[PDB]
Design a binder for these strands. Structure first.
Ligand SMILES: [Zn+2]
Lengths: 162, 726
RNA sequence: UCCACCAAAGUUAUCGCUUUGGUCAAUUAAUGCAGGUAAGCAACAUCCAG
DNA sequence: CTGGATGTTTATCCCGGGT
DNA sequence: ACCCGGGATAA
C-alpha cells in the first residue's frame, strides 16, 4: 500500500501535513492515477490544487489543478476512465475516494470523508485512508462552511509518495 | 490557362486584431443599411415612375451605373468637379433627386457621412445587378406560362368540362381525351402563338384577356421581334429588353389574385450580411489612412490588421499555385477568404458498358433515399443473419439546425415577436405603390429596435429586452451548469453531496456565488461583460457573501447580466455551416468504414420534390458531394421496386394502423395508415407458425433495396431489366 | 408545429412500435478534417423560388 | 432548410481648401 | 505662389 503525503498551506501559512495510504491491490488504476498526479513527474499534479468544496462534519474535496473551481481535472488515461469496483465502502471516517460526475466520469478530483457515508456506497470508488495527520484534516475541516466554500484559501503546496 | 476561385471560412476573433475590430463593426452596420435602403429606394423609384407614366424608360435603367448613383445618393459628401460628369450620370442623379426628398421622409432616413464609398457602391451594386438579372431569368417564363393558363381559364374549363361529362357518365378514357382535345391542345396553340408575339386565333380568349394581352405587348416595341422566334429563349438571351414586361406580368398576376412574387429583389433580413473588404476599403474605412495605397504595399497594409502567417492565408491547393489576393468578405463575425490563381488586372447502371458493369462485382451498395430517413444503405453481400445495413436519418443532419431554431424561438423578447408579427402583415413582394409605401413606413417604425436586437453581437446595447425578470442557475443530470440558457461549464465533481435540501434555504444564495465564480471566469462569458458591469457584479457578489439572505443582490445581478441572454445569431449561422460540413464528413466516414473504402454506390432516381408537410431532403446536392469525394455513384430506376415482395415477388400492402406520426396532427386525426411497413399477401411466402397464420413483414426501404439487388443481379446476368420492374 | 446514435429481444431482414445494455462537448466554442506535436487537403456571398 | 444563376479590382485626372 | 483629401471616370 503506497503512502501519499501532502503539504497544506492556508492563507500562505503552512498548517500541517496529511498522510494517506492507498489500497493499490484492491483499486489498481485509481491508485496509479493518484500516485502519478501526486508525484508530479509528468509536468502536472496536485501542486496548487485548492480545496474548493469543504463541508464541515461531512466531507472535504479537492484535486482541481487546472481551474481550481471544481470544473477542471484530467487523468493519465485521458479525459476520463471507467470505474473498477466497489470492494471498499465509506464505512469509516477519513477514507479517500474519487469524486466524479457519474459512471466512468472519474478524473483527478478526490474527496475525503469525515463521517460514515453508507448512501455513497456503490457510487464512488474508495481507494485510500488517512493514516497520519488526521488532526490537520480536522483543522482544515473546521475552516469549511455548509455551502462548501472555505473560510480561508487552502492550497496543497507540495505532494509526494512514500 | 484556366481560372478557379476557392474560399476559406474563419472568424473575426481569430485573425482580426482587437484594435481594428470596432471600425469594422461600424462599417458593416453602415454598409448593410445603405444596401438595404438602395434596394428599397430603387424599387420605390421604379414604382413611382411606372405608377405615374407608362412611357418611362425603366428597361434602360437596369445597369450597374444607375445602382451606384442610387447608392451614392444616400451618402453625404463634398461634391467634386461638376463638368466632368457624364450625361448618363447627370440624368441618373437628376432622376434620383426627383424622389430623393420624398423617399427620405417616407423612409424616415437621414444621409450617412461615409467617405471613400466608391468601392463599396461598386461591389454592392454589382451584386444588385446580378440579383436583378438572375431573378427574371429564373422565373420569367415560369410565371408567363402561369399567366397564360389563367388567361385561358384552364382550371375553369377543365372543371366545367369534367362536371359536364360526369352528368353524361363518360368514362375516364373519354374524359381524359375530350379534355385534351378541347383544353390542353387549344391552350398549347395559344402559347405557341404568343411565343412569337402574334395574337392567337380569335374566339379562344375573352375580350378582357385580349385587351390584357394587347396591353402586355404594348410594353415591347411594336417593331421589335423576339430572337429565334421564341420569347422564352429571347428572354434568357436578351433579358435587357424584358424587365418592364416582367413588371407588367407581375402586375397582371397580382390582379388575378395570384400569390405575390418578388419581381424587385429586396433585402428584408435585419441581421448584418457579408460585405466585401477590398484593399482600398481596408486602407480608408478601417485603417483610416488618408493617402493612396499602391499594389506593392497592398500586402503590407493587410498584414497590419491580420496575421498573414496563418495557414488559412498562405498558399493552398495543388502545387501551392493559389494565392490570397487581399480580398475577403465579412459580416462582423464570420470571414470568407478568397484565393485565385490569376492576376487582378482587368450514368444509369442499366446503360453501363461491359467494361464497367462487369468489373463492379462484389463492390455495389444499394441506397434508397427516404423522407424521414435520408439514406437506407444495404450491401449486396447482406444476409438475414448478417445485417450490413446502415441508416442515415434526417435527425442526424438537422440536429444543430433544429436546436438553434428552438433556442431562437424561445429567447425572442415579447417586443421583438410583436414587431415581427406587425411587420409580417405587409406584403413586401407586392408591386402596388400604396402597399409598398405602407411596408416602408412599417419597417422604418421599428427598424432601430430590430437592428439593435439583431446587432447585439457588435453594436452597443443600451436597451434591455428582459425587464422585471429574475434568473437563477440550474444543474442537469450530466452536471452541466445552465444559467437559464447559458452554458457555464460541466461540474465534474458535483455528484458527491450530503442529504439533499438542507433546512437552511439561505445556503442556496451562497451556492449562487460559487456558480457566479464558476461563470465569471469563463472566457466566452467574461469577454461579453464590460468592465463597469463586472466591477458592479463583483461588488454585489461580495455583498451576497456578507448578506446571502438578501435576494435584491441576485435580482440586480440578473438584470445586469440580462445582456448575455441575447443570442449571437451570426455565430449560430456560422456554426450551422460547420455542423453541415462535419455531418457530410461524418457520412463519408460511415460509408467508408461500414461497407468499404472502394464501395460503389447505387442511388434511386427519386427527385425528392419539396411538398407541404414535408421538409426539404438531400437529393440533388448529395450526388455532387458523393461524386466530389470520389465514390463511384450510379442511378437505378425505382419503378414498382417497393410494390412487390422480395421473397416471392407478390404484391405488398399496408396493414398496421398507428397513431399519427406527426404529433401536431394527432389532434386533427387519431390514427393513420402505416408508412414504412408492409406485409406479403401470399400465404405461401412464409413458413407460417401454427394456429394463427402469418406472413413475412418487410420495411419499405428494406424491400426496395432487396428489389434493387434483384435488378442488379438480373442486369449482371443478362443486362436486361426484369419485366416485373419495367 | 415535436424527435441524437450503436446494438439485443418481441421477430419472420417487424413500424416515427415497446423493453433493454451502451456511446458524448455539453456549448451563446472553435475555420473543419487529417494525421499523435510540424506534414496534406477543404468554394464563398447575394437574390429568388418553394 | 434546399436548389439555381452570377460575381470574387486597380490606375488616372481635377479642384477647393489650406498654407 | 505649392501640396493634401475627395470625388469621379475608366479598363
Ligand atoms: Zn412474399
Amino acid at each position: 500500500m503506497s503512502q501519499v503525503y501532502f503539504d497544506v498551506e492556508a492563507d500562505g501559512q503552512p498548517i500541517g501535513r496529511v498522510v494517506f495510504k492507498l489500497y493499490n491491490d484492491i483499486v489498481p488504476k485509481t491508485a496509479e492515477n493518484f500516485r502519478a498526479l501526486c508525484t508530479g513527474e509528468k509536468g502536472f499534479g496536485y501542486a496548487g490544487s485548492p480545496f474548493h468544496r469543504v463541508i464541515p462534519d461531512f466531507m472535504l474535496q479537492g484535486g482541481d489543478f487546472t481551474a481550481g473551481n471544481g470544473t477542471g481535472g484530467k487523468s493519465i488515461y485521458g479525459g476520463k476512465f471507467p470505474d473498477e469496483n466497489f470492494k471498499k465502502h465509506h464505512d469509516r471516517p477519513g477514507l479517500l475516494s474519487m469524486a466524479n460526475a457519474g459512471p466512468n466520469t472519474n478524473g483527478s478530483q478526490f474527496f475525503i470523508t469525515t463521517v460514515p457515508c453508507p448512501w455513497l456506497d456503490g457510487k464512488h470508488v474508495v481507494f485510500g485512508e488517512v493514516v497520519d495527520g488526521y488532526d490537520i484534516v480536522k483543522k482544515v475541516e473546521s475552516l469549511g462552511s455548509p455551502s462548501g466554500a472555505t473560510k480561508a484559501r487552502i492550497v496543497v503546496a507540495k505532494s509526494g509518495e512514500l | 490557362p484556366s481560372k478557379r476561385v476557392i474560399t476559406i471560412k474563419t472568424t473575426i476573433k481569430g485573425i482580426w486584431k482587437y484594435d481594428y475590430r470596432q471600425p469594422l463593426y461600424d462599417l458593416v452596420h453602415t454598409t448593410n443599411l445603405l444596401v438595404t435602403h438602395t434596394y428599397a429606394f430603387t424599387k420605390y423609384i421604379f414604382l413611382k415612375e411606372l405608377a405615374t407614366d407608362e412611357n418611362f424608360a425603366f428597361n434602360e435603367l437596369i445597369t450597374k451605373d444607375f445602382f451606384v448613383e442610387v447608392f451614392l445618393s444616400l451618402v453625404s459628401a463634398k461634391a467634386g468637379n461638376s463638368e466632368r460628369l457624364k450625361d448618363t450620370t447627370k440624368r441618373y442623379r437628376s432622376l434620383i433627386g426627383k424622389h430623393k426628398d420624398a423617399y427620405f421622409e417616407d423612409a424616415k432616413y437621414t444621409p450617412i457621412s461615409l467617405a471613400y464609398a466608391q468601392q463599396i457602391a461598386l461591389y454592392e451594386c454589382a451584386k444588385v445587378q446580378t440579383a436583378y438579372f438572375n431573378n427574371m431569368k429564373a422565373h420569367f417564363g415560369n410565371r408567363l406560362r402561369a399567366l397564360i393558363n389563367k388567361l385561358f381559364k384552364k382550371k375553369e374549363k377543365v372543371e366545367s368540362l369534367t362536371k359536364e361529362m360526369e352528368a353524361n357518365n363518360f368514362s375516364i378514357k373519354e374524359i381524359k381525351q375530350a379534355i385534351r382535345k378541347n383544353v390542353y391542345q387549344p391552350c398549347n396553340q395559344v402559347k405557341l402563338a404568343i411565343t412569337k408575339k402574334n395574337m392567337p386565333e380569335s374566339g379562344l380568349l375573352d375580350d378582357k384577356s385580349v385587351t390584357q394581352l394587347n396591353e402586355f405587348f404594348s410594353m415591347y416595341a411594336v417593331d421589335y421581334t423576339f430572337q429565334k422566334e421564341s420569347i422564352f429563349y429571347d428572354v434568357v438571351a436578351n433579358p435587357e429588353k424584358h424587365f418592364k414586361a416582367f413588371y407588367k406580368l407581375a402586375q397582371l398576376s397580382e390582379a388575378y389574385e395570384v400569390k405575390p412574387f418578388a419581381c424587385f429583389p429586396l433585402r428584408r433580413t435585419f441581421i448584418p450580411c457579408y460585405m466585401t473588404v477590398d484593399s482600398k476599403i481596408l486602407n480608408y474605412h478601417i485603417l483610416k489612412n488618408k493617402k493612396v495605397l499602391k499594389m506593392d504595399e497592398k500586402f503590407n497594409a493587410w498584414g497590419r490588421v491580420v496575421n498573414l502567417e496563418r495557414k488559412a492565408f498562405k498558399s493552398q491547393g495543388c502545387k501551392k499555385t493559389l494565392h490570397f489576393q487581399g480580398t475577403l468578405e465579412t459580416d462582423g463575425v464570420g470571414v470568407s477568404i478568397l484565393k485565385q490563381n490569376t492576376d487582378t488586372n482587368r450514368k444509369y447502371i442499366e446503360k453501363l458498358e461491359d467494361a464497367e458493369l462487369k468489373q463492379t462485382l462484389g463492390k455495389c451498395v444499394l441506397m434508397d433515399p427516404g423522407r424521414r430517413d435520408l439514406l437506407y444503405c444495404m450491401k449486396e453481400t447482406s444476409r438475414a443473419d448478417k445485417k450490413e445495413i446502415m441508416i442515415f436519418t434526417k435527425n442526424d443532419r438537422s440536429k444543430c439546425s433544429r436546436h438553434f431554431r428552438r433556442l431562437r424561438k424561445l429567447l425572442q423578447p415579447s417586443q421583438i415577436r410583436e414587431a415581427e408579427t406587425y411587420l409580417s402583415g405587409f406584403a413586401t413582394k407586392s408591386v402596388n405603390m400604396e402597399k409598398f409605401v405602407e411596408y416602408i413606413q412599417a419597417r422604418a417604425s421599428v427598424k432601430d429596435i430590430l437592428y439593435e436586437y439583431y446587432g447585439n453581437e457588435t453594436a452597443k446595447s443600451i436597451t434591455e429586452f428582459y425587464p422585471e425578470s429574475q434568473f437563477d442557475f440550474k444543474v442537469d443530470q450530466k452536471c452541466n451548469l445552465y444559467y437559464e440558457n447559458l452554458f457555464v461549464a460541466k461540474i465534474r465533481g458535483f455528484y458527491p453531496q450530503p442529504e439533499h435540501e438542507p433546512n437552511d434555504i439561505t445556503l442556496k444564495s451562497h451556492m449562487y456565488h460559487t456558480y457566479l465564480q464558476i461563470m465569471l471566469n469563463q472566457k466566452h462569458i467574461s469577454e461579453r461583460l464590460n468592465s463597469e458591469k463586472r466591477r458592479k457584479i463583483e461588488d454585489l457578489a461580495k455583498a451576497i457573501l456578507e448578506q446571502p439572505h438578501e435576494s435584491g443582490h441576485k435580482t440586480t445581478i440578473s438584470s445586469l447580466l440580462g445582456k448575455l441572454r441575447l443570442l449571437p445569431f451570426r455565430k449560430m449561422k456560422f456554426s450551422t455551416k460547420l455542423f453541415s460540413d462535419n455531418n457530410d464528413r461524418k457520412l463519408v466516414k460511415n460509408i467508408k468504414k461500414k461497407f468499404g473504402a472502394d464501395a460503389v454506390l447505387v442511388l434511386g432516381n427519386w427527385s425528392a420534390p419539396n411538398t407541404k408537410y414535408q421538409d426539404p431532403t438531400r437529393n440533388k446536392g448529395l450526388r455532387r458531394m458523393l461524386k466530389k469525394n470520389g465514390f463511384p455513384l450510379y442511378l437505378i430506376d425505382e419503378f414498382r421496386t417497393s410494390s412487390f415482395c422480395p421473397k416471392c415477388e407478390s404484391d405488398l400492402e399496408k396493414f398496421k394502423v398507428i397513431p399519427n406520426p406527426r404529433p401536431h396532427n394527432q389532434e386533427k386525426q387519431p390514427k393513420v395508415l402505416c408508412h414504412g411497413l408492409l406485409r406479403c399477401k401470399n400465404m405461401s411466402c412464409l413458413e407460417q407458425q401454427t394456429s394463427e397464420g402469418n406472413q413475412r413483414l418487410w420495411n419499405r426501404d428494406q424491400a426496395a433495396v432487396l428489389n434493387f439487388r434483384k435488378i442488379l443481379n438480373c442486369l449482371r446476368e443478362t443486362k436486361q431489366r426484369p419485366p416485373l420492374f419495367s
